[PDB]
Amino acid sequence: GKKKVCYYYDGDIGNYYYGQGHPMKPHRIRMTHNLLLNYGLYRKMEIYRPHKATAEEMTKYHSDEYIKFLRSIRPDNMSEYSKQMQRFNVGEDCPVFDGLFEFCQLSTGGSVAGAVKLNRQQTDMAVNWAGGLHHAKKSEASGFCYVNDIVLAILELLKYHQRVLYIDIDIHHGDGVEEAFYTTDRVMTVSFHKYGEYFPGTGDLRDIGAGKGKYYAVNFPMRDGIDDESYGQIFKPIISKVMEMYQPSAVVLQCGADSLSGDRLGCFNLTVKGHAKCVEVVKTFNLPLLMLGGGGYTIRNVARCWTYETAVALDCEIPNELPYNDYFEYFGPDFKLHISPSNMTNQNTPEYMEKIKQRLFENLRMLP
Amino acid sequence: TLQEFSFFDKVRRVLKSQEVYENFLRCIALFNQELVSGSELLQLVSPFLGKFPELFAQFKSFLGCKRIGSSYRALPKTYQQPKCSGRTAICKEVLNDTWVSFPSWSEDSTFVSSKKTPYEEQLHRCEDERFELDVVLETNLATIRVLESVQKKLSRMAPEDQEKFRLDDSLGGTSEVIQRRAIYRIYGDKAPEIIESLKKNPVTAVPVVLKRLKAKEEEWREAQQGFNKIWREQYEKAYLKSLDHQAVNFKQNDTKALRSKSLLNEIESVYDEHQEQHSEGRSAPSSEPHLIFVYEDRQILEDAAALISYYVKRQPAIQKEDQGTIHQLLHQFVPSLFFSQDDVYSLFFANNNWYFFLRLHQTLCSRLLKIYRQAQKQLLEYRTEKEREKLLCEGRRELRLKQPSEVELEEYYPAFLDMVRSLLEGSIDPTQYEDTLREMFTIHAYVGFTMDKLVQNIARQLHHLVSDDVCLKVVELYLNEKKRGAAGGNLSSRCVRAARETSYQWKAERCMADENCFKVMFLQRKGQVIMTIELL
Amino acid sequence: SGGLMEQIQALLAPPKTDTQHELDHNGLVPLPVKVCFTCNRSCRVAPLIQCDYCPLLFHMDCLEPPLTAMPLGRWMCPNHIEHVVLNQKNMTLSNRCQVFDRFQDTVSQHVVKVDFLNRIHKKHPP
Numbered sequence A: 001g002k003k004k005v006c007y008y009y010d011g012d013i014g015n016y017y018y019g020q021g022h023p024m025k026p027h028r029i030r031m032t033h034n035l036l037l038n039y040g041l042y043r044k045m046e047i048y049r050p051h052k053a054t055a056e057e058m059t060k061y062h063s064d065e066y067i068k069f070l071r072s073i074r075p076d077n078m079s080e081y082s083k084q085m086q087r088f089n090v091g092e093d094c095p096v097f098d099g100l101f102e103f104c105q106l107s108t109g110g111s112v113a114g115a116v117k118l119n120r121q122q123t124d125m126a127v128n129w130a131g132g133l134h135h136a137k138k139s140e141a142s143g144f145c146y147v148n149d150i151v152l153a154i155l156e157l158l159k160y161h162q163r164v165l166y167i168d169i170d171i172h173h174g175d176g177v178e179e180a181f182y183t184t185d186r187v188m189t190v191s192f193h194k195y196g197e198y199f200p201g202t203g204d205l206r207d208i209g210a211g212k213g214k215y216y217a218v219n220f221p222m223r224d225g226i227d228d229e230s231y232g233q234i235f236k237p238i239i240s241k242v243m244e245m246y247q248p249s250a251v252v253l254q255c256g257a258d259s260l261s262g263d264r265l266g267c268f269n270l271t272v273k274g275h276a277k278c279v280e281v282v283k284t285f286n287l288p289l290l291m292l293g294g295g296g297y298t299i300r301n302v303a304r305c306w307t308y309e310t311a312v313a314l315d316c317e318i319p320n321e322l323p324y325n326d327y328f329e330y331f332g333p334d335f336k337l338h339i340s341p342s343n344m345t346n347q348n349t350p351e352y353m354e355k356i357k358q359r360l361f362e363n364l365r366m367l368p
Numbered sequence B: 001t002l003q004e005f006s007f008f009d010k011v012r013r014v015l016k017s018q019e020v021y022e023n024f025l026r027c028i029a030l031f032n033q034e035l036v037s038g039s040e041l042l043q044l045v046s047p048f049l050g051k052f053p054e055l056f057a058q059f060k061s062f063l064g065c066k067r068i069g070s071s072y073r074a075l076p077k078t079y080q081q082p083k084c085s086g087r088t089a090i091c092k093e094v095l096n097d098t099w100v101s102f103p104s105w106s107e108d109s110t111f112v113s114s115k116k117t118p119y120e121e122q123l124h125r126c127e128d129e130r131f132e133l134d135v136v137l138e139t140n141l142a143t144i145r146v147l148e149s150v151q152k153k154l155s156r157m158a159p160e161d162q163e164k165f166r167l168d169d170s171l172g173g174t175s176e177v178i179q180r181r182a183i184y185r186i187y188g189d190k191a192p193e194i195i196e197s198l199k200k201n202p203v204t205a206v207p208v209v210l211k212r213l214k215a216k217e218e219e220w221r222e223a224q225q226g227f228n229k230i231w232r233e234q235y236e237k238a239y240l241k242s243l244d245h246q247a248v249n250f251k252q253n254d255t256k257a258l259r260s261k262s263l264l265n266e267i268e269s270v271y272d273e274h275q276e277q278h279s280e281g282r283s284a285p286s287s288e289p290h291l292i293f294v295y296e297d298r299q300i301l302e303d304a305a306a307l308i309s310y311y312v313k314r315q316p317a318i319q320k321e322d323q324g325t326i327h328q329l330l331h332q333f334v335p336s337l338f339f340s341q342d343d344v345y346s347l348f349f350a351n352n353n354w355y356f357f358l359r360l361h362q363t364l365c366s367r368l369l370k371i372y373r374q375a376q377k378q379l380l381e382y383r384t385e386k387e388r389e390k391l392l393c394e395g396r397r398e399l400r401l402k403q404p405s406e407v408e409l410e411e412y413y414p415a416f417l418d419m420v421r422s423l424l425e426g427s428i429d430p431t432q433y434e435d436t437l438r439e440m441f442t443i444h445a446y447v448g449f450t451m452d453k454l455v456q457n458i459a460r461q462l463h464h465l466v467s468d469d470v471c472l473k474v475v476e477l478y479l480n481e482k483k484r485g486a487a488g489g490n491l492s493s494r495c496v497r498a499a500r501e502t503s504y505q506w507k508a509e510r511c512m513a514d515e516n517c518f519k520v521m522f523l524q525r526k527g528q529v530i531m532t533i534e535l536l
Numbered sequence C: 001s002g003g004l005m006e007q008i009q010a011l012l013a014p015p016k017t018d019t020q021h022e023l024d025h026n027g028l029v030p031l032p033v034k035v036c037f038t039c040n041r042s043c044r045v046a047p048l049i050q051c052d053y054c055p056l057l058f059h060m061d062c063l064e065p066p067l068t069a070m071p072l073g074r075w076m077c078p079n080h081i082e083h084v085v086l087n088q089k090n091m092t093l094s095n096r097c098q099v100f101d102r103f104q105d106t107v108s109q110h111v112v113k114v115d116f117l118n119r120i121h122k123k124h125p126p
């Protein structure tokens, strides 16, 4: 039925500048919000301003030294932290820009507030598109991410929920979140990703966990050019089996949009409808769900995808015609909500997918 | 006994090599030294004999720091784990502490240049160009709003208190960086003096900063309007070409893939694979065809015949008698072979040229069917989308371009045929033809990019199919044998006429004893025609 | 090659007043052919990877579990013995190599290996 979905947005998130020519652009969130305003989706949704997360809420997973470095480093004093900058992997790939700590605070606070809201049972759906940074490690920055807010949100969720299930449909492997919970059975991480000469270079079929957390981490490696039909054919049965064996109490869904066709860094061939089919499938199971952002580097497609999933979570149907908005010219020349795929070859043959699915099923049957 | 000798004989025969066989011997010898248990022995021998159930059953009867995964390494035990201040009980009991996973790669970055057509790079560049200007503009506008709000607050209080009002480094906003960033961008090196003036004496300094910011905002807005005008008709020129990932590869790949030698190799390789399988003695019946293709519509057949006739009728080097002969071959004999004039089959014995012609004709028919199906799908999707979007309350459930009418959507396919005819005549340029096809069929248009050449190829085959006595003798032999009914007939009567069919094949062997002989079976089923070709 | 970036960055600038198993060159299945060990098919259906220890060609999908990407280095086919040696991962590669070379000088040994096979084969031990 129709339920309540808390929405977290801070007006200042769109202004933070990663640098010239850097693929990561917070501006996308702003455009997404703008689209939500011009479809009239603010009336059926509750919008909150996320509180900034103190360093004390970040040091629950990150070391105090790394957080102190993040809070201290500025573009005008890069000379006095060079060694530290080498140590914490802050530099070329993850640059130091103006107000990066405030960006991390807002992104983390949105997801932490959503997790607290879900714990208090004031809602069964919280959305934070500023979140979804899953590559950050305990004491280092990786993959354009500085603070791992997914781990902090799950740590907040664990205070009331015995089992938390995390699902990752970003094209990259969520190594930070999987590594944070590699040896525990209270969190199982499902990741669908491209594998083979690709960042971060982890997430093999045989990475199934360690110690007490064995068989509680599943990875589906893929090839170039997966499309909507294959993704739908292999996502629904695997998630159904995971939910029937694991029986979780809360779900955290990472909705990274770099797995769509035409992405500046991705290789897949999904569309907005096929991407949001996963949201529909997850929502079918009626669990406290926390939807997060993530990757996505073709800015217009990110806006389209995230506004469509926000509409889907509200059980609202929106027209295929884009309404007039502040960033309308981004969406030319068609000005449609849905996107068309390319005709790139799908290298994932049916036998490959069947074999990987069978291996995953046999791995899942071993849970107690 | 001799059973063990026979077993070893068949295994070294089936392994087809000495090195793999010797690896098997190394396995069994390592077992013989009592280092291998029986179950472990069979689990090691399973790779060698996993595809021969008989051999596997016979062998079973005869018998009667640490690292995990692939990318996780154990942390040192004597390693000073970085202390954390917020660790609660769940933090200690849940968080991983012993494995660290090292990225198993070094390549810095390649994005996806492998699959990013130059037309997707222009779109990316235009996007980043838009984003830079937009982010600067919106930072300026947010700072303008913040200063307007603080000025409105200031104007409402007592004049003896205004000189006592001050601002911090957030400058009235919720961020300590953004407003200073905007002021720095506006004022260059003089930014710190203006910032100190704003913090110390807001009353006199706010309006002048607001005026400067507003003037810069207006100038940047008009510049952005001009840049928006320029950025358009680059998206228009790049969008449809960015989604078509195969045209550049497809043109050359298809211009090669249709040569006679390539078609011959495509079946010679399959014949060699089947011959090797027969040599190894694997369980495969010796009656399956090497290649199988499907024709799913007769209308596509007469459309293709009409296209080929249209091209051939405008040929200067083909004489009127040859035009008539090709007409009889194309509109009479070929439909008879496909039985246009269940479980009813036709048998045909052909040389190289007829095999080439059949391959090319099947390719053309399949492509025409693909285009037709795409047009039908487009029309259906448009009608369904119209019906769906008509019934939409949108948010109540708590310029642009004019899409074509339905009539154009259903007339796309005849328009496509007219376009193919125009291209064949040479009245339309290949570039305009390709652009119209792309705008008509989006990402499935490339299927028709090299049609004319294909038709040309087919034409040549037809012409040669008249000039070579072997081909006319082949068709005459088929007709003479069909007059007896041995070549092709009902499926059940096969065993009734099988010996007679053998005679036909015999004659084929004595008519093309220096040339490849092809057995072609046309099987009709549920409105489709399956053409199965096997090389003798 | 006219890009708008220079004009935008100037307009926004601060006032700083301071071998054999592969397709031929034209693209053709080489003849005679070598086939996959699992399906007995050539490179036409899919590219073949060649084991560098034994002359066994394989398909990326015909393996179990299938390979996701091309192996960049030296790859080991699943039809060798060093896999059971890999069960114990503590020992280094030099000892493994010396153990293998302990049987690399009398490679035929056909009489003695059939003899050991029948010697073990007796149901009642001697």
Ligand SMILES: O=C(CCCCCCC(=O)Nc1ccccc1)NO
Binding pocket: A021, A022, A023, A092, A093, A135, A143, A144, A170, A171, A172, A199, A256, A258, A265, A294, A295, A296, B108, B109, B111
């Ligand atoms: O989307 C991501 C992060 C992808 C990180 C890819 C790192 C390599 C890279 O492309 N770096 C880069 C490129 C241009 C400019 C600066 C850094 N995770 O989900």
Ligand SMILES: [Ca+2]
Binding pocket: A168, A169, A170, A171, A172, A173, A174, A191, A192, A193
């Ligand atoms: Ca993923």
Ligand SMILES: [Ca+2]
Binding pocket: A181, A182, A183, A184, A185, A186, A187, A188, A189, A209, A213, A216, A217
């Ligand atoms: Ca786990």
Ligand SMILES: [Zn+2]
Binding pocket: A170, A171, A172, A256, A258, A295, A296
């Ligand atoms: Zn990603």
Ligand SMILES: [Zn+2]
Binding pocket: C036, C037, C038, C039, C040, C041, C058, C059, C062
């Ligand atoms: Zn194979």
Ligand SMILES: [Zn+2]
Binding pocket: C051, C052, C053, C054, C055, C056, C076, C077, C078, C079, C080
């Ligand atoms: Zn090998």
